[PDB]
């Protein structure tokens, strides 16, 4: 809970550029074979995005300002990234949103959470019979005053440790506008070594969360494993970005999918 890891080491925040990332479907309005100009919170093209990673001696779980909205782009092998927790104090002082995927379902709840200095979900004793089941819960000690609860459908996620190039890509958009919290999720495989590939992506809505709480900050939750201060985390990389009120030209094909975007 409040016990820091043994190998955890801070690192200077390095930056890198993203190509088209941050483009999403604006609304449920359907459009085909037309060029539309949408002005909303976007990630500017060729904009510097933060460079973070988590390994068994640098473990990055910083708290970053949420502002109006943010863009997340990460790649996973063993699915190190657990989720994100949102809120002002990130403590029981007020309501805080927590999005976590436990490898069974996706838990989305708004409650008063007890803050820990190093929240995460750990596991231990793999060896033979690789296990990877939920054992220790370090996110919060207790909670109460829950104004919202949601649970997704059950599924089996593979947390087995893997080596080599990153075979997956996950790009998310988390924002709060007019007391209405929106999410955009896209999962596509890629062949990647480091940094990011160069291409275009169209993000799709995930869930609708009419919560309406103030979020000035957020923190990324990770999963730890050992074959909890001495537990480690597999190799993974995630990226954070800030959205700005930019206007893109969204080119719609005959099927309605966005082929490309142009930042004015």
């Amino acid at each position: 809970q409040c016990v820091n890891l043994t190998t955890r080491t801070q690192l200077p925040p390095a930056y890198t550029n993203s190509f088209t990332r941050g483009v999403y479907y604006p609304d449920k309005v359907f459009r085909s074979s037309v060029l539309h100009s949408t002005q909303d919170l976007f990630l500017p093209f060729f904009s510097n995005v933060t460079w973070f990673h988590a390994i068994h001696k640098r473990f990055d779980n910083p708290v970053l300002p949420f502002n109006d909205g943010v863009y997340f782009a990460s790649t996973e092998k063993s699915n190190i990234i657990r989720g994100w927790i949102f809120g002002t104090t990130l403590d029981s002082k007020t309501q805080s949103l927590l999005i976590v995927n436990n490898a069974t379902n996706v838990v989305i709840k708004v409650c008063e959470f007890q803050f820990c200095n190093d929240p995460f979900l750990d596991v231990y004793y793999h060896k033979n019979n690789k296990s990877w089941m939920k054992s220790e819960f370090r996110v919060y000690s207790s909670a109460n005053n829950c104004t919202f609860e949601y649970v997704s459908q059950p599924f089996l996620m593979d947390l087995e440790g893997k080596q080599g190039n990153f075979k997956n890509l996950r790009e998310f958009v988390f924002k709060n506008i007019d007391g209405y919290f929106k999410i955009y999720s896209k999962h596509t495989p890629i062949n990647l070594v480091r940094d990011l590939p160069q291409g275009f992506s169209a993000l799709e809505p995930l869930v609708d969360l009419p919560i309406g709480i103030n979020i000035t900050r957020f923190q990324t939750l990770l999963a730890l494993h050992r074959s909890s201060s001495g537990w480690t985390a597999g190799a993974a990389a995630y990226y954070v970005g800030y959205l700005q009120p930019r206007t893109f030209l969204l080119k719609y094909n005959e099927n309605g999918t966005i082929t490309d975007a142009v930042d004015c």
């Binding site: 479907y25 609304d27 449920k28 309005v29 359907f30 459009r31 085909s32 037309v34 104004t147 919202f148 007391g179 209405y180 799709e204 809505p205 009419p210 309406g212 099927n255 309605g256």
Partner: protein, 291 residues
């Protein structure tokens, strides 16, 4: 309007019609009937189970249930004739279906028959002041029915108690379970019963032979409070029949208009309900219920 030839004279404001073609007006087809479509009523809150629960908390132990994020149908409770007395304060029963509420609190407890009259905004009495009280601005409703066929049993049921004495009157929407001995005078008590020292909680005598006036009535108090938070709970829906290939006025969700509904080969993204043209005018829509 007598004949089409006369329309030319009125459009030209003259009694002589020269040889030629003249447009006297522009014809428009009016909508024959109105269309209504919405999603299902599924995923409601089980209000019937609140009053259907086997055991209810004591007047001092009354449980407070928070109901949100669902649809509420109040027509079944009013037309079921399963309630002994039903009354509302500040809101009519027929208007609840058309109103959306952010938070709905359903109170549960059991009180005496003659004690039900003390439940209302700005009331008095033992149960109102020392047990449960309604603020003057309370907008909710009251529901009660005779429990003598369930709670009351042979020999008496003492499981349901009440707070007889309190140093003052309870505040609006306040619940105090403290069992501390009540001190009438200045004589110290120290939790030991005696002179000027009494036990505040008292059990309701429940037997089937008791009078109808004192028969236990299970009361469910719904507290309607509209806060700054968004509204979720709303009344039921309609979703009338659909008509196609005809001029009609259709209203879908928060969209309205007049046009001819015709199924085309276009495919809207599962995450995109409505379409639009280059003019920002919707040329097609998706049924809120059927896909």
């Amino acid at each position: 309007a007598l004949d089409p030839l006369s329309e030319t004279k009125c459009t030209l404001k003259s009694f002589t019609v020269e040889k030629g073609i003249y447009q006297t007006s522009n014809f428009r087809v009016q909508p024959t009937e109105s269309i209504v479509r919405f999603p299902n009523i599924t995923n409601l809150c089980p209000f019937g189970e609140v009053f259907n629960a086997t055991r209810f908390a004591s007047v001092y132990a009354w449980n407070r249930k928070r109901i949100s994020n669902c649809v509420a149908d109040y027509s079944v409770l009013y037309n079921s004739a399963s309630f002994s007395t039903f009354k509302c304060y500040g809101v009519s029963p027929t208007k609840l279906n058309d109103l959306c509420f952010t938070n709905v609190y359903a109170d549960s407890f059991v009180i005496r028959g003659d004690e039900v009259r003390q439940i209302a905004p700005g009331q008095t009495g033992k149960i109102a002041d020392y047990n449960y009280k309604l603020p003057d601005d309370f907008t909710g409703c009251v529901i009660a029915w005779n429990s003598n066929n369930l709670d009351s049993k042979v020999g008496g049921n003492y499981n349901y108690r009440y707070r007889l004495f309190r140093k003052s009157n309870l505040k609006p929407f306040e619940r105090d379970i403290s069992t501390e001995i009540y001190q009438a005078g200045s004589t110290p008590c120290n939790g030991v019963q005696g002179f000027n020292c009494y036990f505040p909680l008292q059990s309701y005598g429940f037997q089937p032979t008791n009078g109808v006036g004192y028969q236990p009535y299970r009361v469910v108090v719904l507290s309607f409070e509209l806060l700054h938070a968004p509204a979720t709970v709303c009344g039921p829906k309609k979703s009338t029949n659909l008509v196609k290939n005809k001029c009609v006025n259709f209203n879908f969700n928060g969209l309205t208009g007049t046009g001819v509904l015709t199924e085309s080969n276009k495919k809207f993204l599962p995450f995109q309900q409505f379409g639009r043209d280059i003019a920002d005018t919707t040329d097609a829509v998706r049924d809120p219920q059927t896909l």
